[PDB]
Symmetry: D2
Subunit: 287 residues, 4 copies
């Protein structure tokens, strides 16, 4: 024979919007939710016995209901509520994992004035989270951002690297740096101001990336920029225990025009989709 | 036997970023361009004669070159320069059409302070344009916006429609209205303040959709909203001669939970991707 | 001040699958349909009067309904039925347009035996159609194929073209030719064997592109290959009156490796997404 | 303060096509590659020291060069060569992980003869792999298939499930089953006939999904179909050690037409993108 390494089932792509009407003032949150369950029994896989299966339509129905019953403050707490539900409202469930994405609605805003009930879509950075809980254990939550495409046109360089027989790249004291940042962090407590924690992380990444809006900040290696950002998050948000960052390097190359008799000294650039540099890192607090 | 009704060829997906730097204060524009040429001879089609063909690679080189030589003030004027170039540098080109999309870079901004050289991607709406010119004739420019996703949670209704065998819909005094607006307008002259124009059209659409940030504005049929915005655009911008608008109705339905013994008082909603209402309209000035 | 040039509304992305079970042998057709209606009255746009509006939900319901009632033999005939219905079941509808996309289900098959009820998704090319009819007029049908990606590794060249100030490209005796074909043709009668005609066009396109299967056939100009195919379709199918073809030129370049001291003698190629050649043409029968 | 958990960097989306010409017979492989390296030194993150950095542009060139130098027989073998190189041509590299996706070119074929140099795109299923190697250690290869959309119109059901407060679903003896299979397996030796292994796994999955092309095989639970496929994969291919399979449930629901006074007798269906059932599992050989 064989041996199970891992099982799970659930409903994916459960889209939902929750509204809270105050005055004429509406609060809105829309997300796409994915829930996975692990069972104590594997008779479902072994012999096709369905008697312990919560039907995927039902888990769909449950997410909708919990939205009504518990309400939705943040994507994280909702995830935690879904988790706790499947672990306490049932007995044969050993593990539940919720991954949800938030739909980036932004309240319409004419300088300081905010519309009571109109919103526009602004994918600046995309918010997501995950909450995973084992039966009778304290839950684990990750939060993160993705697709934050930022661009700086100077105060970046790359020099003094290893040259080998396959190397053709020449040194550069100045070059574009364009990325689409992805970040994912684990919390040390279930007790966090999630909305606020999130904002802080985001603001940190953009900040160490851009530096002072005046003179900028020179960055000599995206590795070092990446590490410096990690450390800054860990100081500002004590409840973050671990942080992972992915920074693609989406290239803009100066178009050489000598073969057509023009001298293009860094006016016109060719944005190149593929391929792309990729720079990663995951750091945690010394236990 | 047969007859040509229409020919064209060129290069598509020509990406470019043009930068203009004042020391540490940098200005940028990035776009994706498509250009098409029509030739006087069809010997290329009839007999495979390449004697009159301007290679697509040359069209690419040219878009690159003109970006350096002419600079890029707007995606529209860039579009007009490409049209003019191929009609005057050659004798046998009868028509040229350039369709271009702007990559929506936004200068980074915190609390009134704006970064000298850093950008974020937050597409309220995506900008695009077209310029089409025949030999020795005056060129025609269209400009437009797309993928502007907006949501209204109230101040919309839909009642008093026709019932037939297939109608199941009941009257509604109040409901969500969500759309992803697309608009395209033909200018009556090449003499336009393009940046201010495009923004003016956008702001008009958002303002008429949302209404006052105080109370909103009721709309009984999206057709009328569509029509009203058209008229409003024709008042606000004299150089616009014709305007087309497509408004999807991307649906948000109140989830019935009675089958699970809960009463959902318009709190939790189901976003439904497909299908979607589609309401279009095209209006021009009466000569 | 103003004047309508064009109006229309409807429901889009209406997905539907129809099944016809004879023995244990199931026949299936799945499509995504979008229908647009034009009304005699414009009081809906002008004054928010909905009394002539056939609700888009009803348009949705009707497409589901006609499917049961008329059944679905082809997307073209279904499109024609939708047309006929809205024109004959109402009097205030002046125009209806149905554009349909077909989901490329292919019956599962191992060694000549065909599963009675299992299917796999292998979109060699994607099929679509359009039907447009004016009140009490004879309808017009278009059919076409899209996203048919094919590649040749030889028997193509591009020499004897124009050099101008911006040309850098040299003669090429041999090169890859890769495209993603789009074709769209109008029938001169509603009386067509649609499944057979469509297949005929497709086979013509690939055959004139690729064959004979041994040594292939040299083509000196993509313009000419496109054209010869237009003539071959017009010879094989008397009911096609007009045909349009678009062929992107998706580039594969031999990677120059001399700068790293290797000689790449046309072994390793760079597939490049952007930019792309584009070659178009529309010819019709000499009336 | 802190301590590293995981570092890595490289080039992503490296596209490559390798051609091998015999007679008139051309062989082709087109793939897209991702390479990640881990270094012994962390001076790069700590202080922005680049003296140990192999530039991503170099990794791109290395990949290109290796395609020419070593050739490309399978995407797995190419992956292993890239691993091998960076670990042996250098000293400071502690780990390399390469991920490759294959572009599904299929040789064009009519009436028993196969074209010598023409291909068409039929992603029946999409192939991919991963090779990860630590310095001086034995490398690990995973391979997989994805986006295999298969559909059956009968021989599936779902009954005898667990009921709770949020359940509305009723027993169902017969229903459509549409999935888009994803499977990924680890080999216990890097010494494998990859092309055949791949193919066997693929055919096994479509095999067990459809049952006999005559009567099908009744299936009561995708968990069992899932598990059943996993064991047949492990018995037919001794070199796969662990197997992961994910199967979405892309729903096709019978359209109730009674509210418009029709009986839709399991003829017409609504395909639903969202939400989707999801059933996963990972089983391995017991050590």
């Amino acid at each position: 024979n064989v041996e199970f390494v891992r099982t799970g089932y659930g409903k994916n792509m459960v889209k939902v919007l929750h509204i809270r009407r105050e005055g004429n003032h509406h609060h809105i949150i829309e997300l796409i939710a994915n829930v996975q369950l692990t069972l104590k029994t594997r008779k479902d896989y072994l012999t096709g016995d369905n008697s312990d299966i919560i039907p995927t339509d039902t888990v769909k129905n449950t997410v909708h209901a919990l939205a009504k019953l518990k309400g939705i403050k943040s994507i994280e707490s909702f995830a935690l509520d879904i988790c706790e539900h499947f672990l306490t409202a049932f007995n044969h469930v050993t593990r539940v994992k919720v991954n949800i994405d938030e739909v980036p609605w932004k309240r319409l805003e004419k300088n300081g004035v905010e519309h009571n009930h109109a919103f526009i879509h602004c994918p600046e950075a995309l918010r997501f989270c995950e909450a995973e809980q084992y039966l009778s254990k304290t839950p684990v939550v990750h939060s993160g951002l993705k697709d934050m495409k930022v661009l700086k046109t100077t105060q970046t360089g790359f020099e003094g690297f290893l040259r080998d027989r396959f190397t053709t790249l020449t040194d550069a004291k100045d070059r574009f740096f364009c990325t689409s940042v992805y970040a994912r962090w684990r919390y040390n407590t279930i007790n966090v101001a999630f909305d606020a924690a999130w904002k802080a992380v985001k603001d940190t990444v953009i900040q160490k990336f851009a530096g002072p809006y005046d003179r900028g900040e020179y960055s000599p290696s995206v590795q070092k920029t990446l590490y410096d950002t990690q450390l800054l998050v860990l100081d500002r948000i004590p409840e973050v225990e671990e942080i992972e960052i992915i920074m693609p390097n989406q290239h803009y190359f100066v178009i050489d025009m000598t073969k057509i008799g023009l001298s293009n000294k860094d006016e016109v650039y060719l944005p190149l989709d593929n391929p792309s540099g990729n720079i990663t890192g995951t750091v945690c607090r010394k236990p």
